[PDB]
């Protein structure tokens, strides 16, 4: 089973296997299975090809691929090329939305070194 | 303890079997004051020990208790519960049942 989301989902339940695509969490995977008509506890076994391509059309409304990687990235490129204050935060790897930088900024800064 | 020499508390026994010793066993596995989820694991572990690992459920626990021997019974029950947590099986009722099976056959 190869979706428009070319990366192959694991041979498990349907709502878990759709989560592996970049851009589909737990809630959006429930919305696709509810709109198609497939139960969430149905595995990749017995999921016929007539039931896979109807999941390709429901996911086709949303851009969820490396094309979604560049749209998140170029939205940040809109900030950094503009010269705004928020664009300066992303270029140095600092927190943006109000987190402190005294201590406990290990996610943004990267590993410690004196 | 230097001056205050007192005894130790006598808790109410097992409501299912009437066993004083099994009431101290469920309190060791009990964490966060969850009595209702602790005794359900201990009862399901002993029923696995009774039906598929030898009859006389009250005696089958005692043979597993005897090989690992108030404080002598206390340290024996604590060694069963703490070794059952670091196993490879799926649930706590399955892990502690295999520990009592190994303690009955002293291995």
């Amino acid at each position: 089973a190869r979706i428009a989301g070319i990366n192959i989902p694991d041979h498990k339940h349907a709502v878990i296997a759709l989560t592996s695509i970049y851009g589909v969490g737990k809630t959006r995977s429930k919305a696709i299975l509810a709109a198609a008509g497939i139960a969430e506890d149905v595995k990749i076994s017995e999921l016929s090809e007539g039931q896979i391509d109807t999941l390709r059309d429901e996911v086709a409304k949303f851009v969820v691929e490396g094309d979604l990687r560049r749209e998140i990235s170029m939205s940040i490129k809109r900030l950094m090329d503009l010269g705004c204050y928020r664009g300066l935060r992303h270029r140095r790897g600092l927190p943006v939305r109000g987190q402190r930088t005294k201590t406990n900024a290990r996610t943004r800064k990267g590993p410690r070194k004196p | 303890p230097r001056r205050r020499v007192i005894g130790q508390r006598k808790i109410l026994p097992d409501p299912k079997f009437g066993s004083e010793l099994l009431a101290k066993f469920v309190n060791i596995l009990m964490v966060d004051g969850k009595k209702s989820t602790a005794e359900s694991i201990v009862y399901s572990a002993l029923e696995t020990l009774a039906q598929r690992s030898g009859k006389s459920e009250l005696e089958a626990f005692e043979v597993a208790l005897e090989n690992v021997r108030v404080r002598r019974n206390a340290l024996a029950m604590r060694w069963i519960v703490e070794a059952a947590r670091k196993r490879g099986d799926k649930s706590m009722a399955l892990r502690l049942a295999n520990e009592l099976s190994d303690a009955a056959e002293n291995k």
């Binding site: 809109r78 503009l82 010269g83 705004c84 204050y85 928020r86 300066l88 | -």
Partner: protein, 79 residues
Amino acid sequence: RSLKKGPFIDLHLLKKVEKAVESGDKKPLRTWSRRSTIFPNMIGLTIAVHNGRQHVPVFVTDEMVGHKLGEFAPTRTYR
């Protein structure tokens, strides 16, 4: 962040936009409104945004519409 019923802008800076459209572009306009929402009628102008001690001119760009003027002025010098 802000509710959709009316984007906020100060009254003194809104008056500075209206004279700038009619009389043409001028020298960069000194102001203190770091909280105003940028409207499309400001595209092209240069607004000097106060950042604590001085005024930094900001050339308004098309994609700046909707943002704040405080998002273009660093308030501290880092070394």
